[PDB]
Design a protein around this ligand. Sequence first.
Ligand code: MYC
Ligand code: MYC
Lengths: 675, 676
Amino acid sequence: SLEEMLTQAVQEADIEQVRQLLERGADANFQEEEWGWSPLHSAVQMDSEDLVALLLKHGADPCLRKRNGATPFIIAGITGNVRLLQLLLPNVEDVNECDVNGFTAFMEAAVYGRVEALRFLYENGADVNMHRKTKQDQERIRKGGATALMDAAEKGHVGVVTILLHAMKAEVDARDNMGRNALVYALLNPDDGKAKAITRLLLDHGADVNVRGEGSKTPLILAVERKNLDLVQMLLEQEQIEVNDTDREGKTALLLAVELRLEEIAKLLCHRGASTNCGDLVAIARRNYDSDLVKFLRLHKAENWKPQSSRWGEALKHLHRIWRPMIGKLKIFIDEEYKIADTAEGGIYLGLYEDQEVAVKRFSEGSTRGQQEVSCLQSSRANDNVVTFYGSESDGSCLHVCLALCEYTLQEHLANHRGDAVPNEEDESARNILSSLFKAIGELHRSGYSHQDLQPQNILIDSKNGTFLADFDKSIKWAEDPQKIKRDLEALGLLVLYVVKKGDISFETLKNQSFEEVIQGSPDEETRDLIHHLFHPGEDRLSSLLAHPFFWSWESRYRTLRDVGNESDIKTRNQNSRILQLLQPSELSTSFAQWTTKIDSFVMEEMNALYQDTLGDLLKFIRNLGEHINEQKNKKMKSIIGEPSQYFQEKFPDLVMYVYTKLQNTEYMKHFPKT
Amino acid sequence: LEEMLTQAVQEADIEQVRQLLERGADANFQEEEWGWSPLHSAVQMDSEDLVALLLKHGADPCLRKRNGATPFIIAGITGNVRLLQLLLPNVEDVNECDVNGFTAFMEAAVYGRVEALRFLYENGADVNMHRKTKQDQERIRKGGATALMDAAEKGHVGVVTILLHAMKAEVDARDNMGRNALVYALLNPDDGKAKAITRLLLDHGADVNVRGEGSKTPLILAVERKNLDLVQMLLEQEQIEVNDTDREGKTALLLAVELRLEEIAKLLCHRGASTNCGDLVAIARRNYDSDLVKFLRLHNWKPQSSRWGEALKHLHRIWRPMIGKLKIFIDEEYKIADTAEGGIYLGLYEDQEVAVKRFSEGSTRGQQEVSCLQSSRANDNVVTFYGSESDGSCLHVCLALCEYTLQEHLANHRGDAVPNEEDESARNILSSLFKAIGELHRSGYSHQDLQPQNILIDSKNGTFLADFDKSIKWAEDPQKIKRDLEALGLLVLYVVKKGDISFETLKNQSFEEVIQGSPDEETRDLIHHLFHPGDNVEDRLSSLLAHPFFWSWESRYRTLRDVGNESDIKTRNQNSRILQLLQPGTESTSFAQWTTKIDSFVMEEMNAYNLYQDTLGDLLKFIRNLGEHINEQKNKKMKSIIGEPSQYFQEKFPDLVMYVYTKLQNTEYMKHFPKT
Ligand SMILES: O=c1c(O)c(-c2cc(O)c(O)c(O)c2)oc2cc(O)cc(O)c12
Ligand SMILES: O=c1c(O)c(-c2cc(O)c(O)c(O)c2)oc2cc(O)cc(O)c12
């Protein structure tokens, strides 16, 4: 706290407290570990001649570097005080000492427009044509290498540029590692006046005008985008300028002028020999409502992008063909032709995000619902079962949310494929859809968000039969109300029935039913138990419910009953054994009590070649039946049973649930199929 | 052709139009794309002759195009007054608006056509009419702007003055967003026109405490524009609330210090702006504004990654300027790895932790990376692509942050599994790579540089593909796909061998050398199929996901059991189909005379009735019979010798799984294979 009380004194500019602590034994070279600012650094920055002299009296190193490698001498280039530079010069080895990015004290006078500081460094040996030497990470991407002339032109300091070109013999056509001269840096100053002045100074000295800057843009191209006829006139005064130069996207200087509705600039470019066959300029000027420019062009007289979606395919071809203004990276047109669905605000339309097909949800930029949607999506990019979030683009008044384009809604999807499966077939599709919903909602909870509006319209299907969660305009962070999760689990239960019933029961119908009514509507015991656990849960239950026998295939259910019936203690009917102790409950009346009286009598006799009405002997009955069903002597028996998995679940619907319940958290859990 | 003759209207040749209108061309012909009739195209180009010539032929001046604007409305844009006169006696309402609510009066304001504006005023046009648009736009509070707002946005000082005085315009009118013309004025890039209109609007009583885009006040827009003149003009109003905050809670003074505007900040303090809305002194200090620093002196984010955790806490804590949506600082503390260009650093992209690969904005490899990523967003096993932000010279590619490289990961978990345990992790890694590379091919891209440094592991042990800086579209060269499958083969061995064999060592080996390095027959066969996928490669990676390499040891044991339970194997019917496929002709394999290679005690006890023959069929019967009875009480002695049966049979006869798989691959008995 002795060194730390001296850094507080320098900021308060109490000169006496500094003298009191420098004689008390405070470190003058003490660098704070965060950014490395020494007391000598902080004094020069705030321009206090007294504190810089007082600390230099106590041996404060003027070569002491900060985190970015800048000495207090270099900082004096920023401050611009000439007598601070005088105080530090006799203790500096090289005046061209640069920080880790290559910034010398000379450059810091140019960047900040410190003329009196710039001149002092000039006569004292500072290099005017010094390129910045930075680290090898920046060098490998052609960064750095700029001079003081470029720095001064970028900042628009007309005073500094004039002195460098005349008094200090600066190279006007010097290049950085990117290949850019000071002319490019000049046209980037938003002030129209300052840019005009520096351009004149640079052109008269011989700066190359056919150079490339940001986006392969020439100075002529930058002048058009700035909408400054004066800057264009100065450039076209050179005859060697290449007017037919193309930028990254292949747009020429003339093309951008017509696009931006600049009558005189477009006229000037044509009169200087710019080619008019680089685009349909007349139609562009026609849609701009520039009658004068349309006529002027009259007197001087391939497609390949293929969309991936099938439903929206032909519509995407049109949206790519037509011209639209870009909202950042998004190409969108608000029309009934490109509408996807209606929402509580703005609706959903087709769009193109970096030439990628996306579905666009629109919000008023002030809407809290828009914020809740974009907040939840950014956290669920790692969620595989949530629609892929591209980004958000603002037009100033409309919040555009671009999402992965899907073919049909879950409600629509179940309808379109309703006629595929015979009515008495294992519904594999229902398990694939519901499981992916468990994964989406489960991982969404671990991400701290709850959907709050789970309905089949909010569940989409892509072209590859994948199911995704979407429409988080009503989502919340469930930390604020921990028990609000129950709504998603309740809606998940209704979705289990909605999907099992292949969509025949409407979701509105399911919302108006009570819990007991919904349970009755389930066709089997596996669905009834699953929905119960969703309405009556106990943080990661949704992952644990993926092992529920609902998601077991009929072979896996058949395989599991076989494997239990192969237990040694069931086959020997060891009443003392653990396995029968678990299967011996208390409970109500099961459908497999006196199970011998409900099976075909022909099968009963051949298998007895001592079955009791216990559960253990039923599974033993399944084990012997399963291993031997295909033997020659059982061909007649095989016709009675048919497919055995369907047979036992048909005669005893509660069998799978009953075995699962008793063996859930036991050693015999190992007989369950792997999940 | 008859209606396509209307192309002459574009050339505005009067002779051909009069000649073809009597030839039978539709004057109201609307092209189906946008609905531009010949009368529409004429008013757009301002042709006095063609409007009269077409009005002679009954051309409807109320005929609407796609956006609902009549040729009369278009005349508001053109500004020719005699076109308005030619159409006025044939228009029901002068305030007829298009589908967005643009009337002929408003179209004169947007384009600054004063002579058109004056004519429409005295003929009944509504000056304070708000735009009535469709309910899609209305439900997001879009539209509703007036002619005063239209003129202020475009900066036409002439039109604003006439509207405020001669035409009784409401100065404090609000749109559906809640914005007045003053907000539309401050958005004009022209400094002069914005200043003039602001004075005209303020003198009439325009509300200055209004909110625009992003809850920005008029004062805030002047500060962000860096225009001292506009700030003084606004602070001349006494009712202005100077301490009003935008959406992000930034006040007028706060934004001024951040942007290094000395005098504006000084002016705001002299007008009563609060100084306790932020650490203003330090902000001016890091801007190197010595005078502004002196002047002011006189007056929970938790990262999810574990490895990079403490570093993300610092990057969120420190202040950095934003490169679009990316917060990044190039420092050794936040370095991840070095690349051929730019290296890899930590960053925050929309407050999310991301790994950033850096390129020069001109680099073609940077373009190939961002090109391949945009196509692989739907690929679950490719690193999640967040977005790309440009700093003007550096292409920043933000990707999902992963913990360790596959090479690093195998080392860190090398000590986990006892050497004689099923390598489950190797199957999870390779399968996800097959899914990643497979779907990448379906997306039309090939990796071309598959190496373990290009395979990442997230926090949840998930494996992802990355480093698409050398990817190509394989349509130009279809057979280059085999290279990715060849590198995939080396990855199969590299992952099975737990990384002990270096990848460079494997790249210098030949095909036959690499195959020899495989420790078992399942790996040996898989690697072969990747080196020889054939010219009909197509979707071979999907078909190889059913290869017994990805079968669990339980699934292999279950399948050999299930085959041994076939009726014709238990009865040893040599004529049957099942045995003909397995045993045709009178054997070279490790299970020939397999009865002589197992412990004699197990061999004898199993013989409890014809004994087991040295045929393959009885081996599967031997596995089935052993499996069903292994846990019986009287077999406790036998159980100890074999141990885990799956491990036993695959070790004594390594080719058993491959031999059964090969013989039953495309048969009815394929059903015994595990489900995929
Ligand atoms: O791609 C999408 C999509 O197709 C639909 C959609 C919704 C309906 O209600 C329909 O009837 C319909 O045909 C499609 O909604 C979406 C909602 C999102 O939040 C995000 C999307 O990407 C989609
Ligand atoms: O998240 C990433 C990541 O962590 C690494 C990485 C980490 C290491 O620890 C290394 O040693 C290494 O070489 C690379 O690379 C990446 C490469 C990408 O193209 C994209 C990424 O998202 C990552």
